[PDB]
Design a binder for this molecule. Structure first.
Ligand SMILES: *[C@@H]1O[C@H](CO)[C@@H](O[C@@H]2O[C@H](CO)[C@@H](O[C@@H]3O[C@H](CO[C@H]4O[C@H](CO)[C@@H](O)[C@H](O)[C@@H]4O)[C@@H](O)[C@H](O[C@H]4O[C@H](CO[C@@H]5O[C@H](CO)[C@@H](O)[C@H](O)[C@@H]5O)[C@@H](O)[C@H](O)[C@@H]4O)[C@@H]3O)[C@H](O)[C@H]2NC(C)=O)[C@H](O)[C@H]1NC(C)=O
Ligand code: NAG
Ligand code: NAG
Ligand code: ZN
Lengths: 4, 598
């Protein structure tokens, strides 16, 4: 689950 | 008969879910090891475990046909079985799956390993995106220096993986069709469980688009005063390298030169963070504090023991793009972030901790339900807190913002600063998936793939490359999520729904009343609010056990994704900006870009  | 089978099926699911959690743990460990330490050995290990799990998933999908699950009484059991039929990439033949994995790691490792030469020193060629290149992009106002770093990065992170990206599209399409979706676009869109989802987003985007146009026009106007008309034209797309971000996805780094009222305060707490001796550890502890202050779940010991919160100082290659990780046991959750001591990074910490909290909140759910209500929900959680953290209200409480007077002009500055992040991002995020959808759907000939990217960036965002590009270049994979095959629509959804969450959390906290001048939405701090926390608990604990409108209903009683809340937040800015652009005779809109030659 990653940052934009 | 069916009654006896449904009892049998319930037991089957209970065991299978636990088995899937345990098997996924093993794959996740190998993926974590590779992302933390990129080597040929770790790549091989990651991909081999994935191949093994894919094989098991195939047997699972096959075994579901032994159960008459569509005939069952329990909506819950049917929902679980349906989740198990969805194979994704694992539907591919053994050899095709292995090749896709090799293709995916080739692209992600390429991105992560990019290094460029210093603009001033062709000797020094060890500048990575994070932090060296991003430092220049965010801080330099030398337009030629900026253009140099833009070209070097895009050539290496983008063009270098064209052939790999082409094979990835082929195999992604093949996988989707084996699951009987038309393309990878439909496969991705399936996560939103709504057959009008694209139209819904087009409708919301159309409502907010005029505000973006006003912000765009004003920023261009202000950039002309800074750089002159030789660098920035009145009527053309904005040269993207001047926007303080490698992808021009958010423009807050240039706030100091485009702020409505330059003589009034502009919130930038990075220097105060450094002065007060902030560390990555402190920032994460503060994020933890925010969550617990809301009566939400404390970070477990495994988080602190196992997380990577600073860039390693040894020689090693790794993925520095911030991420949060669920290991599918109990309390084994981790973040990997190459944390720097800045305001933006303090928001990133809270964003990532938002994922972690979601993991902890639903870890009691069956395996298949241990994910977001939809991918947008997962991205929204931490951003709701970050909206609060960003307020002058909160930043004064924690001593990071000093001698701040909150007059009308300072409020406009702060609203504009927020918009440079939140409104500007919307067309950007939409184009990331509009582009990939069009490739997945076979709507663009391979001969036109690069200019199809820049055409969308022009049409929606009104930005363009600093230099002329052509079909000799391939610029899309220069964005992390494109190289790493991470769906991007989740972020568009997030940026819309996070304002729905924020507005409701603020109302529940007694921090927002539309009829009370003392309680504006744009200065709401939900820190310490157990009432806001209760709403989060009610929603997050559900995981993916129910369709997402039921998860939203659990939060605030609503069932519809809506642009009402984001527009409400920015309404004071809209009124001021429309008037300011008229006052200054600001040109709105842009001619078609000349920067991608067909
Ligand atoms: C994506 O879509 C694909 C279709 O475009 C789909 O592929 C189809 O899946 C079907 C499985 O449900 C499959 O149907 C079987 O066909 C067998 C014979 O097919 C052969 O000849 C075809 C040409 O005529 C060829 O195209 C094929 O390649 C094959 O060579 C049948 O023998 C078989 O039958 C058995 O199963 C049925 C189903 O039973 C069901 O369940 C219970 C029993 O537990 C029943 O009580 C209940 O009534 C229900 O019907 C039995 O009725 C029967 O007695 C046999 O046991 C079956 O019909 C089909 O062949 C296949 N391909 C095509 C081209 O149609 C994919 O599955 C989709 N993928 C995903 C992931 O969803
Ligand atoms: C800092 C660190 O953990 N480095 C490891 C190294 O010990 C190991 O030999 C290598 C094998 O691929 O993977 C990496
Ligand atoms: C002060 C307060 O509201 N504390 C709440 C408590 O009422 C609730 O029972 C618990 C459930 O996890 O969360 C916390
Ligand atoms: Zn995220």
């Amino acid at each position: 689950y990653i940052h934009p | 008969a069916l009654v006896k089978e449904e009892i049998q099926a319930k037991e089957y699911l209970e065991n299978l879910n636990k088995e899937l959690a345990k098997r996924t743990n093993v794959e996740t460990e190998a993926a974590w090891a590779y992302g933390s330490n990129i080597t040929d050995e770790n790549e091989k290990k990651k991909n081999e475990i994935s191949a093994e799990l894919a094989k098991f998933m195939k047997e699972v999908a096959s075994d579901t046909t032994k159960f008459q699950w569509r005939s069952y009484q329990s909506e819950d059991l049917k929902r679980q079985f349906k989740a198990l039929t969805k194979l994704g990439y694992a539907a591919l033949p053994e050899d095709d799956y292995a090749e896709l994995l090799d293709t995916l790691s080739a692209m992600e490792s390429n991105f992560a390993k990019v290094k460029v030469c210093d603009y001033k020193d062709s000797t020094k060629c060890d500048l990575a995106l994070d932090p060296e290149i991003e430092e220049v992009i965010s801080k330099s106002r030398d337009h030629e220096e900026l253009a140099y770093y833009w070209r070097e990065f895009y050539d290496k992170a983008g063009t270098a993986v064209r052939s790999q990206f082409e094979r990835y599209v082929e195999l992604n399409t093949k996988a989707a069709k084996l699951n009987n979706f038309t393309s990878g676009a439909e496969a991705w869109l399936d996560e939103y469980e709504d057959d009008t989802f694209e139209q819904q987003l087009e409708d919301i985007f159309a409502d907010i688009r005029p505000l973006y146009q006003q912000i765009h026009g004003y920023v261009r106007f202000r950039l002309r005063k800074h750089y002159g008309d030789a660098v920035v034209s009145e009527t053309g797309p904005i040269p993207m390298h001047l926007l303080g971000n490698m992808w021009a996805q958010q423009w807050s780094e240039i706030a100091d030169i485009v702020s409505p009222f330059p003589e009034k305060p502009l919130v930038d707490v990075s220097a105060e963070m450094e002065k007060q001796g902030y560390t990555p550890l402190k920032m994460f502890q503060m994020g933890d504090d925010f969550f617990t202050s809301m009566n939400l779940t404390k970070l477990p010991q495994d988080f602190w023991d196992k997380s990577i919160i600073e860039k390693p100082t040894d020689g090693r290659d790794l993925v520095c793009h911030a991420s949060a990780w669920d290991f599918y046991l109990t309390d084994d959750v981790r973040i990997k972030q190459c944390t720097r001591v800045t305001q933006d990074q303090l928001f990133t910490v809270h964003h990532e901790l938002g994922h972690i909290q979601y993991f902890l909140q639903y870890q009691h759910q069956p395996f298949v339900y241990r994910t977001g209500a939809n991918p947008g929900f997962h991205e929204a959680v931490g951003d709701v807190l970050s909206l609060s953290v960003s307020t002058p209200k909160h930043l004064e409480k924690i001593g990071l913002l000093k001698d701040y007077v909150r007059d009308d002009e300072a409020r406009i500055n702060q609203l504009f600063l927020t918009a440079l992040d939140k409104i500007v991002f919307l067309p950007f995020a939409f184009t990331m998936d509009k582009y990939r959808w069009s490739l997945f759907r076979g709507e663009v000939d391979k001969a036109n793939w690069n200019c199809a990217f820049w055409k969308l960036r022009d049409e929606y965002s009104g930005i363009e490359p600093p230099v002329v590009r052509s079909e000799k270049d391939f610029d899309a994979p220069a964005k992390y999520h494109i190289s790493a095959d991470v769906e991007y629509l989740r972020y568009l959804v997030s940026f819309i729904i996070q304002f729905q969450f924020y507005k409701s959390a603020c109302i529940k906290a007694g921090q927002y009343d539309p009829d009370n001048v003392e309680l504006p939405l744009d200065n709401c701090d939900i820190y310490g609010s157990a009432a806001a926390g209760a709403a989060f608990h009610n929603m997050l604990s559900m995981g993916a056990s129910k369709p997402w409108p039921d998860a939203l209903e659990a939060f605030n009683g609503e069932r519809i994704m809506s642009g009402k809340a984001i527009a409400e937040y920015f309404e004071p800015l809209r009124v001021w900006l429309e008037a300011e652009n008229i006052k200054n005779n600001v040109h709105i809109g842009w001619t078609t870009s000349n920067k991608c030659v067909s």
